[PDB]
Design an enzyme around this catalytic site. Structure first.
Site, PDB file in Angstrom:
ATOM      1  CG  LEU A 194      -2.493   8.363  -0.006  1.00  0.00           C
ATOM      2  CD1 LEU A 194      -1.510   9.531  -0.033  1.00  0.00           C
ATOM      3  CD2 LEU A 194      -1.838   7.112  -0.581  1.00  0.00           C
TER       4      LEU A 194
ATOM      5  CE  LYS B  43      -1.053   3.189 -10.285  1.00  0.00           C
ATOM      6  NZ  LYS B  43      -1.403   2.591  -8.965  1.00  0.00           N
TER       7      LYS B  43
ATOM      8  N   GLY C  91     -11.740   0.247 -13.065  1.00  0.00           N
ATOM      9  CA  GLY C  91     -12.554  -0.822 -13.652  1.00  0.00           C
ATOM     10  C   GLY C  91     -12.809  -0.654 -15.137  1.00  0.00           C
TER      11      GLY C  91
ATOM     12  CE  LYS D 157      -3.136   3.242   0.613  1.00  0.00           C
ATOM     13  NZ  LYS D 157      -4.219   3.454  -0.401  1.00  0.00           N
TER      14      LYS D 157
ATOM     15  N   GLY E 176      -6.672  -4.046  -9.900  1.00  0.00           N
ATOM     16  CA  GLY E 176      -7.210  -3.264  -8.785  1.00  0.00           C
ATOM     17  C   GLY E 176      -8.646  -3.649  -8.472  1.00  0.00           C
ATOM     18  CB  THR E 177     -11.891  -2.349  -9.814  1.00  0.00           C
ATOM     19  OG1 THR E 177     -11.652  -0.943  -9.643  1.00  0.00           O
ATOM     20  CG2 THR E 177     -13.371  -2.633  -9.595  1.00  0.00           C
TER      21      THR E 177
ATOM     22  N   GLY F  35      -8.489  -1.535 -15.485  1.00  0.00           N
ATOM     23  CA  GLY F  35      -9.520  -2.207 -16.268  1.00  0.00           C
ATOM     24  C   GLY F  35      -9.329  -3.692 -16.504  1.00  0.00           C
TER      25      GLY F  35
ATOM     26  CB  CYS G 121       0.675  11.641  -4.488  1.00  0.00           C
ATOM     27  SG  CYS G 121       2.116  12.708  -4.760  1.00  0.00           S
TER      28      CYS G 121
HETATM   29  C1  LIG Z   1      -9.575   1.305  -2.987  1.00  0.00           C
HETATM   30  C2  LIG Z   1      -8.405   1.741  -3.831  1.00  0.00           C
HETATM   31  C3  LIG Z   1      -7.203   2.103  -3.233  1.00  0.00           C
HETATM   32  C4  LIG Z   1      -6.139   2.501  -4.033  1.00  0.00           C
HETATM   33  N1  LIG Z   1      -4.969   2.875  -3.464  1.00  0.00           N
HETATM   34  C5  LIG Z   1      -3.925   3.227  -4.254  1.00  0.00           C
HETATM   35  C6  LIG Z   1      -2.613   3.596  -3.696  1.00  0.00           C
HETATM   36  O1  LIG Z   1      -2.455   3.555  -2.461  1.00  0.00           O
HETATM   37  N2  LIG Z   1      -1.620   3.926  -4.540  1.00  0.00           N
HETATM   38  C7  LIG Z   1      -1.784   3.957  -5.873  1.00  0.00           C
HETATM   39  O2  LIG Z   1      -0.821   4.262  -6.619  1.00  0.00           O
HETATM   40  N3  LIG Z   1      -2.955   3.653  -6.464  1.00  0.00           N
HETATM   41  C8  LIG Z   1      -4.020   3.276  -5.727  1.00  0.00           C
HETATM   42  N4  LIG Z   1      -5.230   2.936  -6.330  1.00  0.00           N
HETATM   43  C9  LIG Z   1      -5.339   2.965  -7.786  1.00  0.00           C
HETATM   44  C10 LIG Z   1      -5.054   1.577  -8.325  1.00  0.00           C
HETATM   45  O3  LIG Z   1      -3.697   1.239  -8.007  1.00  0.00           O
HETATM   46  C11 LIG Z   1      -5.241   1.561  -9.834  1.00  0.00           C
HETATM   47  O4  LIG Z   1      -4.325   2.519 -10.388  1.00  0.00           O
HETATM   48  C12 LIG Z   1      -6.658   1.913 -10.283  1.00  0.00           C
HETATM   49  O5  LIG Z   1      -7.617   1.375  -9.367  1.00  0.00           O
HETATM   50  C13 LIG Z   1      -6.979   1.425 -11.702  1.00  0.00           C
HETATM   51  O6  LIG Z   1      -6.991  -0.005 -11.796  1.00  0.00           O
HETATM   52  P1  LIG Z   1      -8.336  -0.907 -11.863  1.00  0.00           P
HETATM   53  O7  LIG Z   1      -9.050  -0.353 -13.048  1.00  0.00           O
HETATM   54  O8  LIG Z   1      -7.642  -2.231 -11.927  1.00  0.00           O
HETATM   55  O9  LIG Z   1      -9.063  -0.625 -10.550  1.00  0.00           O
HETATM   56  C14 LIG Z   1      -6.300   2.532  -5.512  1.00  0.00           C
HETATM   57  C15 LIG Z   1      -7.487   2.153  -6.115  1.00  0.00           C
HETATM   58  C16 LIG Z   1      -8.548   1.761  -5.312  1.00  0.00           C
HETATM   59  C17 LIG Z   1      -9.846   1.375  -5.965  1.00  0.00           C
HETATM   60  C1  LIG Z   2       8.142  14.712  -4.477  1.00  0.00           C
HETATM   61  S1  LIG Z   2       9.414  13.639  -4.302  1.00  0.00           S
HETATM   62  N1  LIG Z   2       7.125  14.746  -3.438  1.00  0.00           N
HETATM   63  C2  LIG Z   2       5.963  15.614  -3.417  1.00  0.00           C
HETATM   64  C3  LIG Z   2       5.982  16.949  -3.828  1.00  0.00           C
HETATM   65  C4  LIG Z   2       4.809  17.709  -3.744  1.00  0.00           C
HETATM   66  C5  LIG Z   2       3.627  17.122  -3.239  1.00  0.00           C
HETATM   67  C6  LIG Z   2       3.593  15.800  -2.821  1.00  0.00           C
HETATM   68  C7  LIG Z   2       4.759  15.044  -2.916  1.00  0.00           C
END
Ligand SMILES: Cc1cc2nc3c(=O)[nH]c(=O)nc-3n(C[C@H](O)[C@H](O)[C@H](O)COP(=O)(O)O)c2cc1C
Ligand SMILES: *C(=S)Nc1ccccc1
Ligand SMILES: Cc1cc2nc3c(=O)[nH]c(=O)nc-3n(C[C@H](O)[C@H](O)[C@H](O)COP(=O)(O)O)c2cc1C
Ligand SMILES: *C(=S)Nc1ccccc1
Lengths: 313, 314
Positions: free
Chosen positions: A73, A166, A224, A45, A273-274, A252, A132
């Protein structure tokens, strides 16, 4: 005779499948379940320096065509995921990725400095989450090309290893070009994961006349079925524009056929994911069987034979 | 109980909120007449350039289980053609008319608007300015380039002495909703915002053929239909909230009266139909009016104003 084997980043993977960061990878039990699954790999995570509660509930809703979420998060904190990587993970069983999602440059710098030794000793691989939240008034980091460049510069300065990033989806060739140009300036960025959710969709329930999640007035990331063509677009766009890097697909995937499309578009690993959220880690046994089935019917023996080979007209 | 789909905006009365999306079934005289004869509340003509354009090589549109993908490339009969339809042919006794304009520079839009002004005055045609349009090489579409967008609205506002609307691409971040709304609010002549154009640059791959499905741009194209509904709702509501001095027109993912109900609950005044209209033809508007009235009857609403923008948050 067929094989789903993938060889990359000085590792061998039994198949290209892994979880998407954020899905079924927050607790010890989840990480163990992922390791004991049929998946080729797993990612922990996305973490912040300290534990985080995340947003108020409901913050996830499954939908006929996918999902919407605003998790915020929620995670056990960096120390927890570092300890898993350092002391608990069975690298004999599969390689491990650690997803990092600090909320500032300083947070990621300080986590990376500590991750360095564990990557060296144990082989955990960093997936840096640039999709993020940013400072008030600014879009998510990878939608702010200057913030993105600063982040990659700082991590590259302090982290003595390859890593991956990512990425959110882009929707314009000028953005594919601008993002790729930046990524290509950092040789330590050896993979790009495309994509995180399609941001800030709004699901409305006709029966209740209301939104379906609590945070941010119901706005949340879509996953999804909704996101497959967007995911394929991004996978292929960066496959083309970043030829010195690997692409990991995310978005997806429900079936072996969907995974086949990710690989045609250029994916090396394929994250789920989904669909994994809805089915649990047993999904990986099904996906490996289905992908082999697709390959058998199409007379392919390895993934190398069709990776990136989507035909244009 | 007596119910009504009537909408009132920009000195006009519309029988119902439905119209075509620009680009769909509105390029030829025959299409424009068919839209006028349909049960729709209004219609908008194909986004135009100063001169006729062939558009991109075919195949350039593909219908899909969950919607559509296209890279049409602005095929259109040219501004003179659409201006003449508005000036001389359209039956305003039947319904109001919008004209969609998509010049490829500020000068192009400025020159078209100078000529449109008199027809807007005399006949009542309403401009929908497409800022979800190609920009100069190396730059994203105009509405993704906030300076270019601002400069475009300044240029048009200077020469066009009427209210108009703007067709917008989707955004995906609250910071972008804020930035876009800030610019739009600076221009009081922008009295409506149409959300949304396609989700840009998706890539459909056919597993059977191992290929893309459209020819232009290596198979990349705009997504419409079921794929886009939550994104459309988000944009409709985001601008409904941030631009209280304007109306929002919804566009994206409308196949049923229930979908239209959702657009209205998010904030939509008019509701445009693209992919579904392409697949079903103008008879769709009879079905959609009937379905929306049905939804309203079951939910005990009599007018659209009773629930427009009233989506409940948690
Ligand atoms: C409940 C949930 C939690 C997620 N948490 C994260 C995360 O912590 N970090 C991240 O990069 N992406 C996170 N995602 C995004 C997934 O990694 C992925 O990019 C997105 O769901 C698309 O894939 P899918 O169509 O297989 O769901 C999250 C998605 C869901 C639905
Ligand atoms: C970059 S390494 N980190 C960052 C910059 C601004 C917002 C969130 C995270
Ligand atoms: C074939 C086709 C042509 C289009 N042409 C235009 C156009 O000329 N101007 C425009 O603003 N939008 C155009 N669009 C976008 C639609 O107006 C609409 O924004 C989009 O299709 C989403 O609605 P839907 O989900 O109802 O298809 C076009 C879409 C399609 C599929
Ligand atoms: C704005 S009015 N028109 C414009 C500017 C730049 C590119 C296309 C169109």
């Amino acid at each position: 005779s067929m094989s789903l084997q993938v060889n990359l980043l000085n590792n061998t993977f039994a198949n290209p499948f892994m979880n998407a960061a954020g899905v079924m990878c927050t607790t010890t039990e989840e990480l163990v379940a992922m390791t004991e699954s049929a998946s080729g790999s797993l990612v922990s995570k996305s973490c912040t320096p300290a534990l985080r509660e995340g947003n108020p509930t409901p913050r996830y809703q499954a939908l006929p065509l996918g999902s919407i979420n605003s998790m915020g998060l929620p995670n056990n904190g960096f120390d927890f995921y570092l300890a898993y990587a350092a002391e608990q993970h069975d690298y004999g069983k599969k390689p491990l990725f650690l997803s990092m999602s600090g909320l500032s440059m300083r947070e990621n710098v300080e986590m990376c400095k500590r991750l360095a030794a564990v990557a060296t000793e144990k082989g955990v691989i960093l997936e840096l989450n640039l999709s993020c939240p940013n400072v008030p008034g600014k879009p998510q980091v990878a939608y702010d090309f200057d913030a993105m460049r600063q982040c990659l510069t700082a991590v590259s300065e302090v982290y003595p290893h390859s890593f991956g990033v990512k990425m959110p989806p882009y929707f314009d060739f000028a953005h594919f070009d601008a993002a790729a140009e930046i990524l290509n300036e950092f040789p330590k960025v050896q993979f790009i994961t495309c994509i995180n959710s399609i941001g800030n969709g709004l699901v409305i329930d006709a029966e209740t006349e209301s939104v379906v999640i609590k945070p941010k007035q119901g706005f949340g990331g879509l996953g999804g079925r909704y996101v497959l063509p967007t995911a394929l677009a991004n996978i292929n766009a960066f496959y083309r524009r970043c030829p010195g890097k690997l692409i990991f697909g995310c978005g997806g995937v429900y079936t072996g056929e969907d995974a086949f499309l990710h690989v045609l578009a250029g994916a090396s690993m394929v994250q789920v994911g989904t669909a994994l959220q809805e089915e649990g880690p047993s999904i990986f046994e099904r996906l490996t069987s289905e992908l082999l089935g697709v390959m058998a019917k199409k007379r392919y023996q390895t993934l190398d034979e069709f990776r990136g080979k989507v035909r244009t007209l």
